[PDB]
Amino acid sequence: QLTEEQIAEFKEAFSLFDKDGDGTITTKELGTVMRSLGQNPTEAELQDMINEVDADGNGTIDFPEFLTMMARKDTDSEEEIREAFRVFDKDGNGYISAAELRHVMTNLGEKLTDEEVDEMIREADIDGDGQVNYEEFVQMMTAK
Numbered sequence: 001q002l003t004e005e006q007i008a009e010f011k012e013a014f015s016l017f018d019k020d021g022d023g024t025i026t027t028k029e030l031g032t033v034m035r036s037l038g039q040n041p042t043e044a045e046l047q048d049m050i051n052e053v054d055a056d057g058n059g060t061i062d063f064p065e066f067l068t069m070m071a072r073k074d075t076d077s078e079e080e081i082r083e084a085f086r087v088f089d090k091d092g093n094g095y096i097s098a099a100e101l102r103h104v105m106t107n108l109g110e111k112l113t114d115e116e117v118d119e120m121i122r123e124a125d126i127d128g129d130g131q132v133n134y135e136e137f138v139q140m141m142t143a144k
C-alpha cells in the first residue's frame with residue numbers, strides 16, 4: 001500500500017493538470033500545463049501524449065493512467081528542458097534561485113513550504129552554491 005502522504009503527493013501532482021477537478025485530464029488541460037512550462041504543443045501532439053497512456057481508451061487521462069505516465073525522455077527532450085529552465089530562471093542569470101523556484105511552483109499551482117523549497121534545492125544542488133544551474137535542473141527534472 002501507499003502512505004497517505006504518497007497518495008497526497010500524487011493527488012497534488014494530478015490536481016496541477018486536472019484544473020477543473022472533474023477527475024480527468026483533457027488535451028485542453030494538458031496543453032495549458034505544457035504551455036506554462038514553455039512548450040507549444042499542437043492539439044494532435046497532446047492527443048498523442050494522452051494516447052500513449054490511455055489504457056481505457058476514453059481519450060483522456062485518469063488517475064491510474066497519470067501514475068503510469070509519471071513512472072515513464074522523448075518528452076523531457078533537450079528542447080523541452082531548456083524551455084522549462086527558462087520558465088524557472090526568471091531573471092535569466094543562468095541560475096534558478098530558491099526565490100525563483102518557489103515563485104514558479106506557486107504560479108504552476110504547487111504550494112511549497114520553506115522546508116520543501118530548501119530540501120528541493122539541497123537535493124538538486126551538486127556544487128553547493130545554493131542555486132540550480134541547467135545541468136542540475138536536468139537531473140532534477142529527470143530524477144527517479
Ligand SMILES: CC[C@]1(O)C[C@@H]2CN(CCc3c([nH]c4ccccc34)[C@@](C(=O)OC)(c3cc4c(cc3OC)N(C)[C@@H]3[C@]45CCN4CC=C[C@@](CC)(C[C@@]36OC(=O)N(CCCl)C6=O)[C@H]45)C2)C1
Binds near residue numbers: 105
Ligand atoms: C522538461 C519538462 C517537464 O515537463 C518538467 C516536469 C517533469 N517532466 C514531465 C511532466 C510532469 C510533471 N509532473 C508530472 C506528473 C506526472 C506525469 C508527468 C509529469 C512536472 C509538472 O509540470 O508538474 C505539474 C514536474 C515534475 C516533477 C517536478 C517538477 C515538475 O514541474 C512542476 N519535480 C520537482 C519532481 C517531478 C520531476 C521528477 N519527478 C519524477 C517523479 C516524480 C515527480 C512527480 C510528482 C516528483 C517531483 O518532486 C517533487 O518534490 N515534486 C513536487 C514539488 Cl514540485 C515533484 O513533482 C516528478 C513537469 C518534464
Ligand SMILES: [Ca+2]
Binds near residue numbers: 022
Ligand atoms: Ca479535468
Ligand SMILES: [Ca+2]
Binds near residue numbers: 054055057058059
Ligand atoms: Ca483514459
Ligand SMILES: [Ca+2]
Binds near residue numbers: 089100
Ligand atoms: Ca535566476
Ligand SMILES: [Ca+2]
Binds near residue numbers: 125128131
Ligand atoms: Ca548549484
